[PDB]
A paper describes a structure:
In this work, we have explored the structure and function of such non-insect OBPs in the mite Varroa destructor, a major pest of honey bee. Mass spectrometric analysis demonstrated that the six cysteines VdesOBPs, whose sequence position do not match the pattern in insect OBPs, are paired into three disulphide bridges (C1–C6, C2–C3 and C4–C5) different from that (C1–C3, C2–C5, C4–C6) of their insect counterparts. The overall folding, determined for VdesOBP1, is also novel and different from the conserved structure of insect OBPs, although some similar aspects can be recognised. Comparison with classical OBPs reveals that the second of the six α-helices found in them is lacking in VdesOBP1.
The three-dimensional structure of VdesOBP1 was solved by sulphur single-wavelength anomalous dispersion (SSAD) with a wavelength λ = 1.512 Å on beamline proxima 2A at SOLEIL synchrotron (Saint-Aubin, France). Data were collected at 1.968 Å resolution on a P3221 crystal form and a second dataset was collected at 1.81 Å resolution with wavelength λ = 0.98011 Å. VdesOBP1 crystal forms P3221 and P21 were crystallized at pH values of 7.5 and 9.5, respectively. They contain one and two molecules in the asymmetric unit, respectively. The chain was built in the electron density map of the P21 crystal form with the exception of residues 1–6 at the N-terminus, while the P3221 crystal form starts at residue 11 and lacks loop 50–53. We checked the integrity of the protein in the crystal and our analysis showed that the protein was intact, confirming that the N-terminal segment is present but not ordered in the crystal. The r.m.s.d. value between the structures of the two VdesOBP1 crystal forms is 1.55 Å. A crystallographic dimer can be reconstituted in the P3221 form, using a symmetrical molecule in the crystal packing. However, the second monomer of one form does not display the same orientation relative to that of the second form when the first monomers are superimposed. Finally, the PISA server reported an ambiguous response for the P21 form (score = 0.49) but discarded the possibility of a biological dimer in form P3221 (score = 0). All in all, it seems highly probable that the biologically relevant form is a monomer.
Numbering used by the authors: 11 to 49, 53 to 147
The structure:
């Protein structure tokens, strides 16, 4: 269980804050109590990962009363990071583009956030030059 080295490229401002790191450690710790990790197939690991992720989003208030992911919360959290204005523009464009694809391809609110997050993970890493080394 090696600690990753992250190169944040042009997006160092996206680094999580101390409150976010402390929260995420405790929220995921609690989710794993009731959704323990297997230690088998890729399919089983992924399902367990996705279940822990939904549990973590709900614990942090990421679904509104209708159960829809809070896309507008995500958008505002990007702006609150205070990226360089040109980089902020590019990151907000990908938020809007990924949201539109997710909500067109899926009616299911969980499938929507999985597609949105997959789309943001790929596109934000490319624009920012983010590299994770384990
Ligand atoms: Ca760097
Ligand atoms: Ca379309
Ligand atoms: Na569903």
């Amino acid at each position: 269980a090696k600690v990753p080295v992250i190169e944040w490229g042009k997006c160092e401002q996206l680094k999580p804050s101390e409150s976010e790191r402390t929260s995420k450690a405790a929220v995921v710790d609690k989710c794993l109590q009731s959704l323990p990790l297997p230690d088998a197939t890729q399919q089983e690991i992924d399902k367990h990962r996705e279940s822990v992720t939904t549990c973590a989003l709900k614990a942090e208030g990421w679904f509104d009363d209708e159960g829809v992911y809070k896309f507008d919360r995500a958008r505002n959290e990007i702006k609150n990071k205070k990226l360089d204005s040109e980089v902020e523009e590019a990151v907000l464009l990908k938020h809007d583009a990924c949201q539109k694809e997710a909500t067109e391809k899926h009616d299911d609110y969980i499938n929507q956030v999985q597609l949105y997050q997959a789309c943001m993970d790929y596109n934000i890493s490319q624009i920012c030059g983010i590299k994770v080394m384990v």
